[PDB]
From a paper:
The findings presented in this manuscript highlight mechanistic and structural insights for D. melanogaster AgmNAT, an enzyme that catalyzes the formation of N-acetylagmatine from acetyl-CoA and agmatine. AgmNAT is a member of the GCN5-related N-acetyltransferase family (GNAT)2 and, in addition to the formation of N-acetylagmatine, this enzyme also catalyzes the production of N-acylpolyamines from the corresponding acyl-CoA and polyamine. As observed for arcaine, arginine methyl ester produced uncompetitive and competitive inhibition plots for acetyl-CoA and agmatine. These data demonstrate that AgmNAT catalyzes the formation of N-acetylagmatine through an ordered sequential mechanism: acetyl-CoA binding first followed by agmatine to generate the AgmNAT•acetyl-CoA•agmatine complex prior to catalysis. After the ternary complex formation, Glu-34 functions as the general base to deprotonate the positively charged amine moiety of agmatine, most likely involving a “proton wire” of ordered water molecules, followed by nucleophilic attack of the carbonyl of the acetyl-CoA thioester to generate a zwitterionic tetrahedral intermediate.
The AgmNAT (CG15766) crystal structure was determined at 2.3Å, with two monomers in the asymmetric unit of the P21 space group. The two monomers are nearly identical with an RMSD value of 0.262 Å when aligning 862 backbone atoms. Similar to the arylalkylamine N-acetyltransferase model, the new structure is primarily composed of six α-helices and seven anti-parallel α-strands. The active site is well defined in the 2Fo-Fc electron density map and is located near the crystal packing interface for both monomers. Moreover, a conserved glutamate, Glu-34, that serves as the catalytic base for other D. melanogaster N-acyltransferase enzymes, is located within an accessible pocket that can accommodate the acyl-CoA and amine substrate, similar to that observed for AANATA. Although only a number of water molecules (36 in total) were sufficiently ordered to be modeled in the current structure, the majority of them are in the active sites of the two monomers. The closest ordered water molecules to Glu-34 is ~ 3.7 Å from the Oε1, positioned slightly too far for a hydrogen bond; however, we anticipate that the conformational changes upon substrate binding could promote hydrogen bond interactions between ordered water molecules and the functional groups in AgmNAT and substrate. In addition, unlike Glu-33, which is exposed to the bulk solvent, Glu-34 is relatively sheltered and placed close to the hydrophobic core of the protein and next to residues such as Leu-36. In the current AgmNAT structure, Pro-35 is stacked on top of the imidazole ring of His-206 side chain.
Residue numbers in the entry: 7 to 216
The structure:
Amino acid sequence: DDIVVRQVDVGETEQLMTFLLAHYYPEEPLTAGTHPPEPEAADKEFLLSNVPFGTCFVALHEGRIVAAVVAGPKDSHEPEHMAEEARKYAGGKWGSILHLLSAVETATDVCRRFSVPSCLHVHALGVDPQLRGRNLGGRLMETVAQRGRDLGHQLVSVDCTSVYSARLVQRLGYQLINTLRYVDHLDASGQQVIRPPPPHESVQTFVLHL
C-alpha cells in the first residue's frame, strides 16, 4: 500500500516523458535496433497522444514516478492507420519502427480476428528496477485491464519485445497469438528493418480477454 497508482493527465506529461526516456527507451529493442539510436520526436509524441484517452497510468513512490504504462484504444482500422503512418514516415528511424509495428498490426489484426469491436493496446511499459519487490509492472497492467473493463473494452493487447514483458503478461494469463522474428522482417528491398542487440529476437503479441 506504499505505491500510488494514478491516471496520467493531459497537463502532467513532461514528467512522464522524462521517466520514459530514463527507464523505457534506453533498453527498448525497436529503439536500439534502428541506427539513429535516439527516439525521434514523432515517436515520443505518439506515445503521449494516448494520454487524452485516460488510459495511461503511473506508479508514484513518494511522489516520484517509479513506473509508467502507456496504452490506448484501437479498432479494426488500426492496420490501415499503421500502414498509412508507415508510408508517411519512410525511411527515417520512426519509419523503420512503424514498418515493423505495421506488419505486426496487420498480421494480428485483433479486432477482426477475435470478432471484437475494440481493443485496449499497451504501447509502452517502463519500470525503475531499483524497486524490486513492488510488483510495479503487474499492478500497472492490472490497472489498464480494469480501466479497460470500465470502458467496456473486451480485449487488451500488447506487443512484447523483451523477456521481462513476455513473462509478466504470460503470468497474468495473456495468450500468445503471433511471433515475428526481426531477422524474418525485411523491407521492399529485402533489407533487415530492425536489428536490435542480443538477446532480442522477435516481437511477440499477447492478448487478454476481458
